[PDB]
Nucleic acid binder design. Structure first.
Ligand SMILES: [Mg+2]
Ligand SMILES: [Mg+2]
Ligand SMILES: [Mg+2]
Ligand SMILES: [Mg+2]
Ligand SMILES: [Mg+2]
Ligand SMILES: [Mg+2]
Ligand SMILES: [Mg+2]
Ligand SMILES: [Mg+2]
Ligand SMILES: [Mg+2]
Ligand SMILES: [Mg+2]
Ligand SMILES: [Mg+2]
Ligand SMILES: [Mg+2]
Ligand SMILES: [Mg+2]
Ligand SMILES: [Mg+2]
Ligand SMILES: [Mg+2]
Ligand SMILES: [Mg+2]
Ligand SMILES: [Mg+2]
Ligand SMILES: [Mg+2]
Ligand SMILES: [Mg+2]
Ligand SMILES: [Mg+2]
Ligand SMILES: [Mg+2]
Ligand SMILES: [Mg+2]
Ligand SMILES: [Mg+2]
Ligand SMILES: [Mg+2]
Ligand SMILES: [Mg+2]
Ligand SMILES: [Mg+2]
Ligand SMILES: [Mg+2]
Ligand SMILES: [Mg+2]
Ligand SMILES: [Mg+2]
Lengths: 46, 260
RNA sequence: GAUGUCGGCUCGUCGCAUCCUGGGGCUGAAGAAGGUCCCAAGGGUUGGGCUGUUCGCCCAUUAAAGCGGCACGCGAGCUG
RNA sequence: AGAAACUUGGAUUUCUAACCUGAAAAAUCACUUUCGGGGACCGUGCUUGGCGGGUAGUUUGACUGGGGCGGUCGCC
RNA sequence: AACGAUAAAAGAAGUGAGAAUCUUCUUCGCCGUAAGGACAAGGGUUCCUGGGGAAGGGUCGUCCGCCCAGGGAAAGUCGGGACCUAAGGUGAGGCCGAACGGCGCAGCCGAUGGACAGCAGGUCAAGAUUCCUGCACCGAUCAUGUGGAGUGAUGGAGGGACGCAUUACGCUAUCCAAUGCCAAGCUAUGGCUAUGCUGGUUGGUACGCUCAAGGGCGAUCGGGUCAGAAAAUCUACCGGUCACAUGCCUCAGACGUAUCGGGAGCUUCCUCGGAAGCGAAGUUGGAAACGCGACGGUGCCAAGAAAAGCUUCUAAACGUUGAAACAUGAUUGCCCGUACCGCAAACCGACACAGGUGUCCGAGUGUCAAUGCACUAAGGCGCGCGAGAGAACCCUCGUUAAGGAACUUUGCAAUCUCACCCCGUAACUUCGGAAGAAGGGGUCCCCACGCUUCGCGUGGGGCGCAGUGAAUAGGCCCAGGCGACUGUUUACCAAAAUCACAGCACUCUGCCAACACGAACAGUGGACGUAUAGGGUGUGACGCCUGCCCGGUGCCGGAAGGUCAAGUGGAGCGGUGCAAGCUGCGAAAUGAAGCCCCGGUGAACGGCUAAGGUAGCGAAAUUCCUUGUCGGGUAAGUUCCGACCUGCACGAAAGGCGUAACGAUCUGGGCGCUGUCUCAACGAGGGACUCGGUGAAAUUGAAUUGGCUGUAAAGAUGCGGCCUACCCGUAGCAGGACGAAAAGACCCCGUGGAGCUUUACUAUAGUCUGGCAUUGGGAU
RNA sequence: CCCCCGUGACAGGGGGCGGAGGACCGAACCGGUGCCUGCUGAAACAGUCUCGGAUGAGUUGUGUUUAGGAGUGAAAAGCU
RNA sequence: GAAACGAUGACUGAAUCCGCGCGGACCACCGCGCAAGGCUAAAUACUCCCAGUGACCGAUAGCGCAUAGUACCGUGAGGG
């Protein structure tokens, strides 16, 4: 039973990363939306 | 001829001589552009490289050459002939039927109508049979590079020569284009029986998949209980038999009696 | 806002319009073997071939190889 | 009733400065080009009509001794 | 109910408030191509020390991967960065786009790969090509001296540089044998007194005329300018010369000497346990890699990265008295990762989860071989509930009288069968196969002889019920239906007669190809392919073959006429004003594809009034009547095989009829063999039961919850009459409580939905076509 | 490829050698044939036994590309 | 629709003061206006934030929160 989650550092950093949210504005949208979300923690500190 | 095999579940092969392996670009396999898959299948292969090969053969004009070896390379389906010139420059060309190893090949407008020689159509004799023809002066040869193919000469116009393309189509090709004497040898590919399933794979991926296997979602022929279908059409409902897919164009008046 | 449905297997139990066995009347019942009707439900009612089949056909038997009910008895018992 | 002449239009034909377009040391480009070919077409912009399950939105009645099928919907 | 695998544990000893569980000893069973060891990913102090006992641990707990605190992780050389590039990402300029944005040459990023300087040991409680000891090596800056003169670029060239299978030779790791060498000692049980027993038996560096299989290299003069943009002494060439086998170059690895290590043990001290000191021999014989020598050899078709470092050559520049090169000291080595887990108690799975996870090493004995099988070494572990009982039932195994498929939907299941050697082996056949067809026989131990190696054959002899003596280990055959075949498919009820498949056919496409993605005269895929190509379609090896009918539908071709849009054109009609004039509608002709119309096309949809079945086949995967009728087998045969023809409703590439081989396919039969069965029995183990510890769940109107008859919304414990019945439990069984579970998936209803289809409606991408625009000139 | 034998329409036949394959048997590994056990189970798809492929259309790591009327699909309306 | 007028996408493309646009097809009168050039607080909207009050809540209310977008769930967006 190979599970859905197969942790890869360089992956979770390539997709989802702050630098990753940089390239597009859907992700910068996500950023500011998250900042106001309460003080959440945006992806790559987690 | 061809190679054959005793009964182990087999038929044919080809026969390849003159071994070298020399000096050319890599290439990668892929089936599509920025998006999803365009041209269906052919995602397999033996990881061929590419041999940049001269077609136009202009700048070697006036300079003779000797055939070095004849190597059989993919992305071609033709014999590749190696050339060495008097310049010291080596170059690749296609290898017409019956070209021995180490004959003499010369380019230019002055050249003699012998095997492998490059020279424009205006000099090409009446009824002669040649391959590797440009549609336009310069660029390269888009005509008669394939398996066992050739094009003959049907007459002259002004700048134009009437040529016979190997669908059996008559066309007007101007005499300002270079051409290469002879038919591309290629043995005969129609011979080789391509073995069994996966002999495909050797050169390219999983072949025809019948839309009638598919489902209404997938293709038109899809759906139903049984083996059948009604209205006869492709991915998009154009249809295969006898529908001209051509458009009204420029070279269309540079074309005469296309029938078949 | 659920009463699982054919057939089998397992377990039974019940009715009698009785297939056997028991008691009788009549007989176109000499005897033997029967045909029919009346009383009788204690017990008994075989093994195989084909078919998913109950039914049915056939093999070899037998005192006989009974008919129905029990949600066409039985899946919180089995099969499927 | 001949025609010099500016001619406004349609038809085949031809030309080259538009435009497309390949070669050359300068790979996509731009450049000067010898240029080479195509060329008033093709492309593309507006409009015109056709075609168009490829796609898209929807329609597909009721009665009915369950529904369907058959039948029946008004009037005397 | 359970406490998460049936790999069992036992005693003593210790500690403590308390021990089945923590510590130690001694035994026991278990893995050992692992259940040992090393890494990667990922986890994040889980490591070590000293504590701790709440919770976490399926019981316990003095214990732990839990809690607290402290410590521990060292690099010029290993892996990465300061180097290079692949897919991909990116991208000034550049090409597009209602926006946000999509592209894109160079360049750049990007290891999974290229390049690149050390090895051997020691050791803290916890690090080691990192620290220390021994001896290395690389680049850099500079100093004495040699030389005593050229260095020789973002540019050229060379080279990096690459497949698969198979294989000759030499060697090592490494393992095996021994009356080799060394060391220690005693050994009794009946013997052995060593010829027994146990353990150990070279790693690095250096020189050396030693030994060595294997491995790859031609050298210089010169010529043409047209070749490497230019240059050149470098490279590519055509030529001349000397080189055929000797020849050169390097030596994996062995040998000797040296030397630094290590080494069985050994001695001393012991804070009760480790420290510290010492140190023997290193042989002969055999086996042996997927590693090394190497970029080896031969063959094959599908024809097997790039780029830097690097080697040579010039351009430019500075210098040609103080160059490049060498060794000879010195100085110099920046950044990040190194603990621990890492086939799992620490990663992904809520869990201390029977699952999952890529690479490396993986010993010995027996066995043709082996990573197989059994047992074992080093190493690791007995699975964090126990203990008793020996009922039903349940699971997993063992044996079975007589019978042997009578069981059943079906031999489902489970036997039988089994390895290697010898002999032997059918129809049919694509001459490969069928085949391991079918059968039959051998198998152990000792002795002599022989032999081509482990061993093997021959002869003789011995033992047992039996000698692949235990483990690994095909039952077989005769007929068919389907598909040819290997293969592929429904992650979680369907592996097939599906899909694919080689082969065959129709058709499209002349190359900014048709065709497909796309806000787009961008770009890209087809393809760096070009008409024995590329697309779409349908058939499905192979063999014999593929018939009749185009009326209707699509499709290509045609041209007499019919109909038709915008538009060009404008007869005429009207409003208004005194008019000039401004204005509402408006025809005839002329105007394109298009459809009607003529023809043709079926391996185009399609048919058996367009004709209506050519072969081949037929009660078939199509057959209704139907268990059709004869036969075959059977004691009996609704299935199966064969034959007939009345084919309800076979039939020729939605292919027809055949076919050897193949098949975890489907169907019928036989042999073999069996607990499938008559008909069950005994035996084992794991649950079930009992005691101590931890302790859930679905369900639940409330219940103080019987039977038969009846009655009620038509199936009564709860209504009636009659019967039965002391209170409460435990092990059991499954009839009832219309028992539980999911607001039935069937069915109907809803002017509820969504997928799909089309000659239902409607729009539209797309595409075609007339006009106008870019868009201009002349002959005519 | 090297030797022995055979061409009356007939082919190649025996030996030596070589190492071919969508060849065989079979562990890894990849896969799921049949029965049983299991039914919040050890497990939200397994376990034992049996079975299939086992040099090929093979298996697998890393980096990456493709997606909602959309992708992907040796084609179940499967997978995303 | 009798559809005027503003507004552009494509073809077209006038006047200029005895002139031009309008007044809901259009005409004439009659009026109203002078386009193709730009800027221009104020009165209007909103509440991250500060103050004041309330026939607003008072711990299942009141914001999600008597502070936490934390724990916790998800690859993520997101939820909480
Ligand atoms: Mg289908
Ligand atoms: Mg469709
Ligand atoms: Mg269809
Ligand atoms: Mg019943
Ligand atoms: Mg109705
Ligand atoms: Mg346990
Ligand atoms: Mg044990
Ligand atoms: Mg063992
Ligand atoms: Mg506890
Ligand atoms: Mg010894
Ligand atoms: Mg455990
Ligand atoms: Mg072993
Ligand atoms: Mg028996
Ligand atoms: Mg017996
Ligand atoms: Mg039977
Ligand atoms: Mg029976
Ligand atoms: Mg069986
Ligand atoms: Mg098949
Ligand atoms: Mg299955
Ligand atoms: Mg036909
Ligand atoms: Mg019969
Ligand atoms: Mg198969
Ligand atoms: Mg009571
Ligand atoms: Mg009461
Ligand atoms: Mg009562
Ligand atoms: Mg029970
Ligand atoms: Mg219920
Ligand atoms: Mg309902
Ligand atoms: Mg379907």
């Amino acid at each position: 039973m190979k599970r859905t989650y197969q942790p890869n550092n360089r992956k979770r950093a390539k997709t989802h990363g702050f630098r990753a949210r940089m390239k597009t504005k859907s992700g910068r949208n996500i950023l500011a939306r998250r900042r106001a979300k309460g003080r959440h923690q945006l992806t790559v500190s987690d | 001829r061809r190679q054959m095999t005793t009964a182990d579940f087999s038929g044919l092969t080809k026969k390849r001589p003159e071994k070298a392996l020399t000096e050319a670009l890599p290439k990668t396999g892929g089936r599509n552009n920025r998006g999803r898959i365009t041209s269906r299948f052919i995602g397999g292969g033996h990881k061929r490289l590419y041999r940049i090969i001269d077609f136009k053969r202009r700048d070697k004009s006036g300079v003779n050459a000797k055939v070095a070896a004849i190597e059989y390379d993919p992305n071609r389906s033709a014999r590749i002939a190696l050339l060495h010139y008097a310049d010291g420059e080596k170059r690749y060309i296609l290898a017409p039927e019956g070209l021995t190893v180490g004959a003499t090949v010369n380019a230019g407008p002055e050249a003699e109508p012998k095997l492998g020689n490059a020279l424009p159509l205006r000099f090409v004799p009446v009824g002669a049979v040649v391959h590797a023809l440009e549609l336009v002066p310069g660029k390269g040869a888009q005509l008669a590079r394939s398996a066992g193919t050739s094009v003959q000469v049907q007459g002259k116009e002004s700048d134009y020569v009437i040529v016979r393309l190997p669908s059996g189509e008559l066309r007007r090709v101007h005499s300002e284009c270079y051409a290469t004497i002879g038919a591309v040898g290629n043995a005969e590919h129609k011979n080789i029986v391509l073995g069994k399933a996966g002999r495909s794979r050797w050169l390219g991926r999983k072949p025809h998949q019948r839309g009638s296997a598919m489902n209404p979602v997938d293709h038109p022929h899809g759906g139903g209980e049984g083996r059948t279908g009604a209205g006869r059409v492709p991915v998009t409902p154009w249809g295969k038999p006898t529908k001209g897919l051509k458009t009204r164009r420029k070279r269309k008046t540079s074309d005469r009696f296309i029938v078949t």
